[PDB]
Amino acid sequence: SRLNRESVIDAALELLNETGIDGLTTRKLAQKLGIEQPTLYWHVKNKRALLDALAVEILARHHDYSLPAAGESWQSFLRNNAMSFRRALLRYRDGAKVHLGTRPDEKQYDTVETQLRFMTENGFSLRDGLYAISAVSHFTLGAVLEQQEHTAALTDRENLPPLLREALQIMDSDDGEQAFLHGLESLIRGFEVQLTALLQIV
């Protein structure tokens, strides 16, 4: 097959979706691509390189709300950005796992700079703006992680107390979206309390 950047990543995304993060071995990638391993090594040195590139491409493909609308409130931007990030992370098997620990790629610099600048323009110190964005990112990654990994575990592997029993029905009543959106509102409002408080005790 074609071994340009785009096609290697396509194939790796396919292989990820088919077999998860453990299936992504340079060995199985060579098979999908129809090549020998030294051929693949010329293009792709190791799993880390591959994963870093997949993380960027997952957002290029499916992260459709990466910048604020004109005059958009910071609350609304974080909300829309979070839902977009969640969507993108859920579109491939183990995609959140792929994203973990990545730092912004050079291709993403202008976008992440604008996000950070936008927060400071709305009254946050750089630090407080970053802690908000971070918290949103972290909560969204955890929520997605937990969902994706739960589904995996249900393909592999009775005296419940009553509240737990009900709580289990509730979590499993949708894909996680209800709990995620409730949490996201809580988070955004907590940032707001913090921001508006200025130097007052809060």
Site for Cl ion in 2-31 (CB under 5 A): 2-3
**3-class secondary structure, 21:** helix
Exposed e or buried b per residue across 55-82, where buried means at least 16 C-beta atoms within 10 angstroms of its C-beta: bbbbbeebbebbebeeebebeebbbbbb
Site string for ligand TDC, 48-87 (x = CB under 6 A): -----------x---x--x--------------x---x--
Q: Which of residues 36-65 bind its own copies (CB under 8 A)?
A: 46, 48-49, 52
Rounded to the nearest 10°, the torsion over CA 40, 43, 45, 49 is -120
- Which of 197, 195, 75, 99 minimizes the C-alpha distance to 148? 99
Q: How far is the CB of 138 from ligand TDC (least distance, A)?
A: 9
Q: How far is the CB of 125 from ligand TDC (least distance, A)?
A: 14
Residues at the site binding ligand TDC, with contacts judged by CB under 6 A: 59, 63, 66, 81, 85, 103-104, 108, 111-112, 115-116, 133, 136-137, 167-168, 171
